[PDB]
Swiss-Prot record, chain C:
Subunit-structure text: Component of the 19S proteasome regulatory particle complex. The 26S proteasome consists of a 20S core particle (CP) and two 19S regulatory subunits (RP). The regulatory particle is made of a lid composed of 9 subunits, a base containing 6 ATPases including PSMC4 and few additional components. Interacts with NR1I3. Interacts with PAAF1. Interacts with TRIM5. Interacts with ZFAND1.
Protein name: 26S proteasome regulatory subunit 6B
Localisation: Cytoplasm; Nucleus
Section of the entire sequence shown: 71 to 209 of 418
Taxonomic lineage of the native organism: Eukaryota, Metazoa, Chordata, Craniata, Vertebrata
Originating species: Homo sapiens
Positions of transmembrane segments: none
UniProtKB/Swiss-Prot annotation, chain D:
Keywords: Proteasome
Subunit structure comment from the entry: Component of the 19S proteasome regulatory particle complex. The 26S proteasome consists of a 20S core particle (CP) and two 19S regulatory subunits (RP). The regulatory particle is made of a lid composed of 9 subunits including PSMD6, a base containing 6 ATPases and few additional components.
Task performed by this protein: Component of the 26S proteasome, a multiprotein complex involved in the ATP-dependent degradation of ubiquitinated proteins. This complex plays a key role in the maintenance of protein homeostasis by removing misfolded or damaged proteins, which could impair cellular functions, and by removing proteins whose functions are no longer required. Therefore, the proteasome participates in numerous cellular processes, including cell cycle progression, apoptosis, or DNA damage repair.
Name of this protein: 26S proteasome non-ATPase regulatory subunit 6
Matching PANTHER family: 26S PROTEASOME NON-ATPASE REGULATORY SUBUNIT 6, 26S PROTESOME SUBUNIT 6
Species whose genome carries this gene: Homo sapiens
Lipoprotein listed as a keyword: no
From Swiss-Prot, chain E:
Protein name: 26S proteasome regulatory subunit 8
Domain of life, per lineage: Eukaryota
Lineage: Eukaryota, Metazoa, Chordata, Craniata, Vertebrata
Chain's role: Component of the 26S proteasome, a multiprotein complex involved in the ATP-dependent degradation of ubiquitinated proteins. This complex plays a key role in the maintenance of protein homeostasis by removing misfolded or damaged proteins, which could impair cellular functions, and by removing proteins whose functions are no longer required. Therefore, the proteasome participates in numerous cellular processes, including cell cycle progression, apoptosis, or DNA damage repair.
Recorded family membership: Belongs to the AAA ATPase family.
Oligomer and partners: Component of the 19S proteasome regulatory particle complex. The 26S proteasome consists of a 20S core particle (CP) and two 19S regulatory subunits (RP). The regulatory particle is made of a lid composed of 9 subunits, a base containing 6 ATPases including PSMC5 and few additional components. Component of a complex with USP49 and RUVBL1. Interacts with PRPF19. Interacts with TRIM5. Interacts with NDC80. Interacts with PAAF1. Interacts, in vitro, with the thyroid hormone receptor (in a thyroid hormone T3-dependent manner) and with retinoid X receptor (RXR). Interacts with ERCC6.
Gene responsible for this protein: PSMC5
Source species: Homo sapiens (Human)
Subcellular location: Cytoplasm; Nucleus
UniProtKB/Swiss-Prot annotation, chain F:
Induction text: By FOXO4; expression in embryonic stem cells (ESCs) is mediated by FOXO4.
Name of the gene: PSMD11
Sequence similarity: Belongs to the proteasome subunit S9 family.
Protein name: 26S proteasome non-ATPase regulatory subunit 11
Chain segments annotated as transmembrane: none
Distribution of this protein across tissues and organs: Highly expressed in embryonic stem cells (ESCs). Expression decreases as ESCs differentiate.
Compartment list: Nucleus; Cytoplasm, Cytosol
Domain of life according to the entry: Eukaryota
Record's function text: Component of the 26S proteasome, a multiprotein complex involved in the ATP-dependent degradation of ubiquitinated proteins. This complex plays a key role in the maintenance of protein homeostasis by removing misfolded or damaged proteins, which could impair cellular functions, and by removing proteins whose functions are no longer required. Therefore, the proteasome participates in numerous cellular processes, including cell cycle progression, apoptosis, or DNA damage repair. In the complex, PSMD11 is required for proteasome assembly.
Length: 99, 53, 139, 378, 90, 52
């Protein structure tokens, strides 16, 4: 395999034995697929932004056939912006559970 | 509060007395230790019982 | 004869020894070490070395010519820097500092206290701090 | 709703088993029978409880219109599938299964709670469902099937502390973990008393403390239990409120041995008009007598029971027949005396006791390796 | 075109927002009830949600110097005054 | 009002009148409210040791 260690002679530089992969560094730090829980709709004060996410993420997931009937592509990438710590993390954490 | 601060110092001072005047022996009769504390022996029996327990 | 056999292996050390560091082990009695000569090898190990001494990335001894695992060093050997040695306390008492009573008390519990009261953090759910940072105007 | 539903099953636990005590019981059972839309468990008392009132027609219409208030929407849902989402919507069975436990029975609860179990896979949904199986596990008191789902929630749902399902890890030390194994599950697991307030579902705090002080003095005799019950501050406020708790605590630690029969009978008089009426002092009194005796017989190795006639209580013959019960059946390690009038105690040594203990465990492991020697090798 | 799409703005929070943010970031604690969190949220006129997380650490810090696993209202009322004092630079 | 110096005094005096009239935790709380308020006076040359 490419990117795999081998045992090598010092004189004729011949291979002796495939050495095993130590860890897979991507697959050792494989990113966690942890449980999608919500804290629910009780993030009030953000409900206008919540209605935007439902109509751009949930509505493609829940209603594919509205896009299939009307003939329009479903989105796949949403950008969020604002000051940091205003729920950039914790809101998309919740929406992945609502769907 | 002379009530709490004396009495907790007072009830500390009993066994401060008692560790010296019990130290020299192993086996005494209790009327002598009631005399060296200069007190009735009734509370001394209750105070010493608190010490072992 | 097996105990006479263990002793007669021990001529292999003889102290012209070079120093590497243990890296990994493939299988029974064959491993990988990283030398202090810059390169990286695939070596054999003696049956004498007790296998409890391995994986801190321990400092190890190696043969010159044939380059095998021969000896396991004390682990603090290859360090190249030392601690506060024995006497170089800079002669500053704790009461020498004047009027930093918030911050003197804060750092003192930031260092010494979790040695004793460690589980009071987890019962609250504090997750006690590993490090501390200090900053301010110069002086 | 379901948070004041604790009272109904407890008052139903109270009524019928004291046969003579039934006057004020029926005077507020009528509050629990025809009010609050309570439907099932008194029609099953039709040959258990009294003659009856006409409870048939007035409430079978009230179970009907309230079922007809609910049974239309639950079985159909189909409403927000008009805009074709997942061909379903999540507002139907998660919102009305709670009525199927409160007024609907366990049968309407068991088929609804498992139906909303596989509906949503969150722990926060499995939070409230399993806690409803356990609250109804006290209601109809089917106290064997709901011993299972506690451990089934201890395994998977419990991942820690860190205020959480600790809301009903107030379903993990007074409904299921310490019942009839109780010598030490009150001991090790009652270490935390750490809050005070009575929220809208914390309906029992002050009388709940009277439990955990009557079970407090049980775990450890004097390797400093006295800090967590007397030097403790949240316990100090309620004994400042309640003298029956305070005097009963301060009888035992302060060694007022004479007032124990007073302070036990006041606890006993409290145990005369309490709901707990099927299996009783699986710790308490004549262990609390031996708890009083283990500290009294300590510090005195040559005692006379003439001194017992006033220091602890009266009845010279009553103490004498009392200690005859306790010594002779393997408790209260001492040796009572006749007409010299002595209560003499003997203790094991620092090595005689352990040689008695190593001879017990050594025989068990020897008998063990007897068997495994011959299971293998023919 | 095609790859990514619509953008959503986040304003600075409010009283009902910071109160919810307070309950979420103080969720994983061992705290004591008998407290007005709504006063705590309304002592902060313009705090951010990340500043709320620093308050819950200092309340647990004040709980530690009590030698208690209780977390009282006295701990938060000093911690709000401390973090806003740290927020007193512009 | 806005005042700062007098408010340290009246909270300190109310910390007396519950301990003198036998109320510890209300006097403990009224002491602490005077502690955080006294973090804004540039010269308490006598009121510091009175609070101490």
């Amino acid at each position: 395999t490419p990117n795999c260690r081998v045992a090598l002679r010092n004189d004729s530089y011949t291979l002796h034995k495939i050495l095993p992969n130590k860890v897979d560094p991507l697959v050792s730090l494989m990113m966690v697929e942890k449980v999608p829980d919500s804290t629910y709709e009780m993030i009030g004060g953000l409900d206008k932004q919540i209605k935007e996410i439902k109509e751009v993420i949930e509505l493609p997931v829940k209603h594919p056939e509205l896009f299939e009937a009307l003939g329009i592509a479903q989105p796949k990438g949403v950008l969020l912006y604002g000051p940091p710590g205003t729920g950039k993390t914790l809101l998309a954490r919740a929406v992945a559970h609502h769907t | 509060i002379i009530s709490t601060h004396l009495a907790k110092l007072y009830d500390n001072l009993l066994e401060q007395n008692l560790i010296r005047v019990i130290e020299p022996f192993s086996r005494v009769q209790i009327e002598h230790i009631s005399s060296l504390i200069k007190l009735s022996k009734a509370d001394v029996e209750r105070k010493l019982s608190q010490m072992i327990l | 004869e097996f105990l006479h056999a263990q002793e007669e292996v021990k001529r292999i050390q003889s102290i012209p020894l070079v120093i590497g560091q243990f890296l990994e082990a493939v299988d029974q009695n064959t491993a990988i070490v990283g030398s202090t000569t810059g390169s990286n090898y695939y070596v054999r190990i003696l049956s004498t070395i007790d296998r409890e001494l391995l994986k801190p990335n321990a400092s190890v001894a190696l043969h010159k010519h044939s380059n095998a695992l021969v000896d396991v060093l004390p682990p603090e050997a290859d360090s190249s820097i030392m601690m506060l040695t024995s006497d170089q306390k800079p002669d500053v008492m704790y009461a020498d500092i004047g009027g930093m009573d918030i911050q003197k008390q804060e750092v003192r519990e930031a260092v010494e206290l979790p040695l004793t009261h460690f589980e009071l953090y987890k019962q609250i759910g504090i997750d006690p701090p590993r490090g501390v940072l200090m900053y301010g105007p110069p002086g | 709703p379901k948070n004041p539903d604790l009272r109904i099953a407890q008052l139903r636990f109270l009524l019928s088993l004291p046969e003579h005590r039934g006057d004020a019981a029926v005077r507020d059972e009528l509050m629990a029978a025809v009010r609050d839309n309570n439907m099932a468990p008194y029609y099953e008392a039709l040959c258990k409880s009294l003659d009856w009132q006409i409870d048939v027609d007035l409430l079978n219409k009230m179970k009907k219109a309230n079922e007809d208030e609910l049974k239309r929407l639950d079985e159909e849902l189909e409403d927000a599938e008009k805009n074709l989402g997942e061909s379903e919507i999540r507002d139907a069975m998660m919102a009305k299964a709670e009525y199927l436990c409160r007024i609907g029975d366990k049968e309407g609860a068991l088929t609804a709670f498992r139906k909303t179990y596989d509906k949503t896979v969150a722990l926060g949904h499995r939070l409230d469902i399993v806690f409803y199986l356990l609250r109804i596990g006290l209601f109809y008191m089917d106290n064997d099937l709901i011993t299972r789902n506690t451990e089934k929630a201890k395994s998977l749902i419990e991942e820690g502390g860190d205020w959480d399902r600790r809301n009903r890890l107030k379903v993990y030390q007074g409904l299921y973990c310490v019942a009839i194994r109780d010598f030490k599950q009150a001991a090790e697991l009652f270490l935390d008393t750490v809050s005070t307030f009575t929220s809208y579902e914390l309906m029992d705090y002050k009388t709940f403390v009277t439990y955990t002080v009557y079970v407090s003095m049980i775990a450890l005799e004097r390797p400093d239990l006295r800090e967590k019950v007397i030097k403790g501050a949240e316990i100090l406020e309620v004994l400042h409120s309640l003298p029956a708790v305070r005097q009963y605590l301060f009888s035992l630690y302060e060694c007022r041995y004479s007032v124990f029969f007073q302070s036990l009978a006041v606890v006993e008089q409290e145990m005369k008009k309490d709901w707990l009426f099927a299996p009783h002092y699986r710790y308490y009194v004549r262990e609390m007598r031996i708890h009083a005796y283990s500290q009294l017989l300590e510090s005195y190795r040559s005692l006379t029971l003439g001194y017992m006639a006033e220091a602890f209580g009266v009845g010279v013959e009553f103490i004498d027949q009392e200690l005859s019960r306790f010594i002779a059946a393997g408790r209260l390690h001492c040796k009572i005396d006749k007409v010299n009038e002595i209560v003499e105690t003997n203790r094991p040594d620092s090595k005689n006791w352990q040689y008695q203990e190593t001879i017990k465990k050594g025989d068990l492991l020897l008998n063990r390796v007897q068997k495994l020697s011959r299971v293998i090798n023919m | 075109p095609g790859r990514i799409d619509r953008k959503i703005e986040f304003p600075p929070p409010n009283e009902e927002a910071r109160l919810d943010i307070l309950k979420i970031h103080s969720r994983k604690m061992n705290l004591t009830r008998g407290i007005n969190l709504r006063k705590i949220a309304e002592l902060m006129p313009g705090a951010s949600g990340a500043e709320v997380k620093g308050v819950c650490t200092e309340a647990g810090m004040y709980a530690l110097r009590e030698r208690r696993v209780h977390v009282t209202q006295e701990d938060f009322e000093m911690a709000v005054a401390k973090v806003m004092q740290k927020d007193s630079e512009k | 009002m806005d005042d700062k110096a007098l408010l340290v005094e009246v909270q300190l005096l109310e910390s007396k009148t519950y301990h003198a009239l036998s109320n510890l935790p209300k006097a403990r709380a009224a002491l602490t409210s005077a502690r955080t308020t006294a973090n804004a006076i540039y010269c308490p040359p006598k009121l510091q040791a009175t609070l101490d």
